[PDB]
From a paper:
To gain insight into how the CP mutations alter the physicochemical properties of CPB, we determined the crystal structures of both CPB CP and CPB CP_v1. Therefore, the structure model of CPB CP was generated using a combination of RosettaCM and Rosetta/Phenix crystallographic refinement (TFZ = 16.4 for the initial model building, and Rwork/Rfree = 0.2709/0.3092 for the final model). An individual alignment of PB1 or PB2 of the CPB CP_v1 structure with the respective domain of CPB CP showed a Cα root-mean-square deviation value equal to 0.6970 or 0.7679 Å, respectively, well within the acceptable range of two superimposable structure models. A large fraction of these residues, including the four hydrophobic residues, were absent or lacking their side chains in the CPB CP structure, a striking deviation from an α-helix-containing ordered loop found in apo-CPB. This suggests that the conformation of CPB CP renders a temperature-dependent dynamic disorder and that CPB CP could be condensation-prone due to increased hydrophobic surfaces.
Centriole duplication begins by assembling a procentriole in the late G1/early S phase, and timely activation of Polo-like kinase 4 (Plk4) appears to be central for inducing centriole biogenesis. Here we demonstrate that Plk4 promotes its own ring-to-dot localization conversion by autophosphorylating and transmuting the physicochemical properties of its noncatalytic CPB, thereby causing it to rapidly coalesce into a nanoscale spherical condensate with a distinct constituent phase.
Residue numbers in the entry:
A (entry chain B), B (entry chain A): 3 to 67, 76 to 222
Write the structure that this text describes.
């Protein structure tokens, strides 16, 4: 708990990503599995299966001795708080993969007067992309802001301290982009509060308005 | 006002519906024009143009003596409340045209556990269509409820004694549709309440969730 936040894979599209360290996948049930694989002879196979619940709270490990291996009798279960030092690095690897996905998949896609405002799933501090209808793009991250001109020229900035030195050509775009970012954030809280009151379908992702 | 409610053409797609009596169209400015047409020589033309504001409150009529002609000096203006008996019938013609459009264009398109719930623009009492993933359809109007079974059989319900005559197989569907209806209406009110506070682009139409 002291190293990383719980893995949350709510509302993510299913995917099976094969990497050099392990094969990590998001299931249709929103659970995340990491398959530890080892090379042998002319065909590799699975050595250990780590399955993390969609909220990151419950972890099960099994191995019966391109699809998820079936559950077996040789299965152990731990809670997030009671995760051993073994599997510690493995959980974080799965978390990194999930963040890589949450950073790209949108949560609120809002079409305003001048741009397509996209609020990403990787909350808190969720990434926010503003695609202006004129070709200009602003990409807001928690750490930095990327600004791209219509001609393909681009540059990165960092923070509020740079505002009083910003050219008007960008400042007007930014004044709007921050208004759009506020609106998406305001709606997220407003709808999320309504979502929590009803045991029903999720209310995300949402699309507001239509592109012109 | 005692005859019809004001014409409202907010958030509607542009359209030009041509008849042999008049041409009624929705502009990209959300204004609605009715062009009175008469046959002339080898090419028919417009004799009088009536322009209704997007909220139905302001009506202007002009004619200087395939799109609306530019405004002229021979123009008169009325408010909705003091609209003369002359041209009264034309306002109603445009009003019914807009309602036909508002009845079909969606406002909230919500994907729940079992159906695609569509809340239409023709508020108050907006039509609500529930398209179940298994093929069952329930169409709720202010006046009646139409139920279409998965096998193609269909019937309408006009009174409670008929609603309570439904098979339990269908009552389960109707109970679900009513919960979907409540949620869409609750969100419609909640978002509208936020929309009224924000000097920005409209917050409708919206899509909630993704088809499974």
């Amino acid at each position: 708990r002291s190293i990383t936040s719980p893995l949350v894979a709510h509302r993510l599209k299913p995917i099976r990503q094969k990497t050099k360290k392990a094969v990590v996948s998001i299931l249709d049930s929103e659970e995340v599995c990491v398959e530890l694989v080892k090379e042998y002879a002319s065909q590799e196979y699975v050595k250990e299966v780590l399955q993390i619940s969609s909220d990151g709270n419950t972890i099960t490990i099994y191995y019966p001795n391109d699809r998820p291996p079936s559950p077996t009798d040789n299965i152990s279960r731990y809670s997030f708080d009671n995760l051993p030092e073994k599997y510690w690095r493995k959980y974080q690897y799965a978390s990194r993969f999930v963040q890589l996905v949450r950073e790209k998949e949108p949560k609120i896609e809002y079409f305003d007067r001048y741009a397509k405002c996209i609020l990403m799933e990787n909350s808190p501090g969720a990434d926010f992309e503003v695609w202006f209808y004129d070709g200009v793009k602003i990409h807001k991250t928690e750490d930095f802001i990327q600004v791209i001109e219509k001609t393909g020229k681009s540059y990165t900035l960092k923070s509020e301290s740079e505002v009083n030195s910003l050219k008007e050509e960008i400042k007007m775009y930014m004044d709007h982009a921050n208004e759009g970012h506020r609106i998406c954030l305001a709606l997220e809280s407003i709808i999320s509060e309504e979502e929590r009151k009803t045991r029903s379908a999720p209310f995300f992702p949402i699309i507001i308005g239509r592109k012109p």
